[PDB]
Amino acid sequence: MQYKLILNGKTLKGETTTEAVDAATAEKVFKQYANDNGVDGEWTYDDATKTFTVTE
């Protein structure tokens, strides 16, 4: 499935996507993406839109 990540970081803002077998998998991929880009924040997941958010 294709998942979306919306970043509302102090420095980095915007949207990215990834393909993963399920949401728990996508969450790990996106948490690594956020970490690798310097973001550490609060998370949501909305299954009804396949969208994660991370907010600082």
What range does the domain containing 39 cover? 1-56
Among 55, 52, 56, 53, CA closest to 20: 52
Resolution as reported, in Å: 1.1
Q: Which pair of tokens denotes residue 55? A: 């907010």
User: How far apart are alpha carbons 29 and 38 in whole angstroms?
Assistant: 14
User: Which whole-number Å values give the CA distances from 11 to 4, 16, 19, 38, 51, in the listed order?
Assistant: 19, 15, 25, 9, 20
Domain count, the chain: 1
Q: Which pair of tokens denotes residue 24? A: 């728990």
Query: The CATH number of the domain where 8 resides is what?
Result: 3.10.20.10
Q: Which pair of tokens denotes residue 3? A: 């998942």
